[PDB]
Amino acid sequence: VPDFETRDPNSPAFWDERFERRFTPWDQAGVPAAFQSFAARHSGAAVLIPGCGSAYEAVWLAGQGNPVRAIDFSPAAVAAAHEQLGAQHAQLVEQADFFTYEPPFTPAWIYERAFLCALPLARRADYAHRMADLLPGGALLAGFFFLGATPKGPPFGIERAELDALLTPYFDLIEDEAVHDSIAVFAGRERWLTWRRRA
Numbered sequence: 001v002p003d004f005e006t007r008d009p010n011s012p013a014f015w016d017e018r019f020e021r022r023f024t025p026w027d028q029a030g031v032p033a034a035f036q037s038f039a040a041r042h043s044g045a046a047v048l049i050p051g052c053g054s055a056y057e058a059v060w061l062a063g064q065g066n067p068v069r070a071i072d073f074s075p076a077a078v079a080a081a082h083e084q085l086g087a088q089h090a091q092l093v094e095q096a097d098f099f100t101y102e103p104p105f106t107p108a109w110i111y112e113r114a115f116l117c118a119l120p121l122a123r124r125a126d127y128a129h130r131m132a133d134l135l136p137g138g139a140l141l142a143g144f145f146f147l148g149a150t151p152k153g154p155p156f157g158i159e160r161a162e163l164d165a166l167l168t169p170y171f172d173l174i175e176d177e178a179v180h181d182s183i184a185v186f187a188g189r190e191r192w193l194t195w196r197r198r199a
C-alpha cells in the first residue's frame with residue numbers, strides 16, 4: 001500500500017524497509033494453531049526456521065524444548081525476532097542467508113511460513129535444492145504454503161502444479177490441510193503442507 005524505495009526482494013534492505021516502517025502484512029502476531037499441533041507431534045525434532053521474521057514459532061519451540069535455529073538475512077527482521085525472544089532465547093536466532101547457512105544440527109523438520117512466497121520466482125529452484133540438501137531421507141519440510149498464482153509479489157503465490165514440479169523430485173506430499181486461523185492476506189490461500197524427503 002505505502003510507497004517503498006527498495007524493490008528487490010533478494011535484498012535484505014528490501015525487507016528492512018518493510019519491518020522498519022511497520023508494514024508487515026504477513027505477520028501472524030502469534031503462533032499459528034496448525035504449527036502448534038504439528039510441533040506437538042514431533043516434540044524431539046530439531047527444527048530449522050528460514051526467513052523467520054519475528055520468529056514467534058521459535059519462542060514457542062523454545063518452550064517445548066526442541067532444538068531450534070531461526071535465521072533471517074534481514075537486520076530489521078532479526079531485531080523483531082530479538083524483541084520476541086528476549087535475552088533469554090536470543091541465541092536461537094541468527095542473521096543469516098538461508099542459501100549459505102549450515103545449521104549446527106541435521107534438521108528433522110524445516111518449518112515454512114511466508115518464506116517461499118517471499119522469494120523471487122528465480123530463487124524457487126534454489127529453494128528446492130537447498131531443502132533437499134538440508135533434509136535427510138524421511139525428514140520433513142512442513143508448514144504454510146501460499147497457493148495460487150498472484151499478479152505481483154511478494155508474496156509470490158505458487159500454483160499447486162508448479163509446487164509439485166519443484167518439490168516432488170525430492171519430496172513426497174503426505175499432508176495437505178485447511179488452515180483455520182489464517183490472517184487476511186493468507187485466508188483461503190495458505191494450506192499446511194507436509195513434505196517427506198525421499199530416500
Ligand SMILES: Nc1ncnc2c1ncn2[C@@H]1O[C@H](CSCC[C@H](N)C(=O)O)[C@@H](O)[C@H]1O
Binds near residue numbers: 012050053073114115
Ligand atoms: N535468503 C534468505 N535468507 C534468510 N532470510 C530470508 C531470505 N530471503 C528472504 N528472507 C526473509 O524472509 C522473511 C519473509 S517475511 C516472513 C517472516 C516469517 N517467516 C513469518 O511467517 O512471519 C523476511 O524477514 C526476509 O528477511
Ligand SMILES: [Cl-]
Binds near residue numbers: 026114117118154
Ligand atoms: Cl512473506
